[PDB]
Amino acid sequence: QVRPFLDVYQRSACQTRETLVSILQEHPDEISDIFRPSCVAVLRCSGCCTDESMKCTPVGKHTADIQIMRMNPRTHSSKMEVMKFMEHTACECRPA
Amino acid sequence: EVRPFLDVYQRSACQTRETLVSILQEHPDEISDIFRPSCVAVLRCSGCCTDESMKCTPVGKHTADIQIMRMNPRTHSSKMEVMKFMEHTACECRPA
């Protein structure tokens, strides 16, 4: 089936979409333990704008609370815990 | 509202997911015309393997026909046309 033009723009457009981020990357301050999973999916702005002169930019954000598993690499002890992650809420193509 | 673990895992796992690819990166030879949209969303493998020494890799590929607008900067015409893109059918965590 050919994916119709409107269905194409619907997904290509600048907007918030599921984006994988590394826990250790988002929290560089976390440098003693392992996390499972090691990455989480959160909304981030992405999509192609009218031209490369513009970039899909976040104009709003918030903090999501996500449950993950903290694994102590030294004792192999792991336990559920809630960690905060930054998430984009609104997007717009901007000059940048 | 905390995001429950099982849900966090379901999304973070290595699997095929919506991925933005520019028409130029998927069709490097298409350098003369302008496309609307200039990028498309297609299924590609990504995710964080439980085993950190593993990388999320495609184990099957297929194609998708997508309708796009081609704008000719010389003739100034712009019409619809079907363009094919590669997608990942399935993935697996493999050392790499």
Side-chain angles (χ1 to χ4, degrees), chain B residues 21-69:
Chain B
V21 297
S22 68
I23 280 82
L24 269 184
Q25 47 192 168
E26 299 305 306
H27 294 278
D29 57 289
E30 291 286 9
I31 62 175
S32 55
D33 299 323
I34 292 169
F35 297 92
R36 279 184 171 189
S38 69
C39 75
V40 300
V42 294
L43 262 27
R44 298 296 173 79
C45 295
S46 63
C48 42
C49 293
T50 293
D51 184 335
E52 45 278 72
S53 62
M54 304 280 112
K55 69 178 300 180
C56 189
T57 310
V59 298
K61 297 186 292 187
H62 65 276
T63 56
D65 296 320
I66 299 178
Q67 188 169 51
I68 303 170
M69 178 151 256

Side-chain angles (χ1 to χ4, degrees), chain A residues 66-84:
Chain A
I66 306 184
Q67 181 174 50
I68 57 176
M69 205 156 77
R70 192 171 195 114
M71 218 282 274
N72 185 314
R74 294 165 301 287
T75 65
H76 288 66
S77 162
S78 54
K79 181 168 189 170
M80 291 299 143
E81 122 188 2
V82 176
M83 184 170 282
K84 294 183 177 299

